[PDB]
RNA sequence: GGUAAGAGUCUUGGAGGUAGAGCACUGAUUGGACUAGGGGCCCCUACCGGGUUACCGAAUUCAGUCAAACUCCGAAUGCC
């Protein structure tokens, strides 16, 4: 319920979505035009804890 | 006591909105064009807008109804 509503009202263009790959997780968004390596490293991390 | 006014009928002139009719007001309404505005869905909304709505209906309009506290009208009888 905060995952569609996150997806489709919140966050706006070129924000990069993060989900683990064929397991269910947490829906990771960071919401900056540009993503750093660092901050996608960072962000596959949360979203890789925030799983099965 | 006044006295012959009283009453009925023919003729004439009036006031007063009932029966009936009608939307010319006040409401309630049914259908079609007309669509102010609101409803989902795609481009997009971090937000302005666009499309389709076999989607509701405040306006307005062609029609169709209804009304003791609606009347543009309007009797028969009663009344003076």
């Known amino acids: 319920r905060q995952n569609e509503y996150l997806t489709t009202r919140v966050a706006a263009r070129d924000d990069i979505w993060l989900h683990t790959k064929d397991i269910p997780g947490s829906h990771v968004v960071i919401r900056s035009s540009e993503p750093d390596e660092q901050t996608i490293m960072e962000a596959a991390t949360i979203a890789a ?4």
């Not at 804890?49 to 099965?52: E, G, I, L, N, V």
């Open 49 to 52: 804890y925030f799983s099965k």
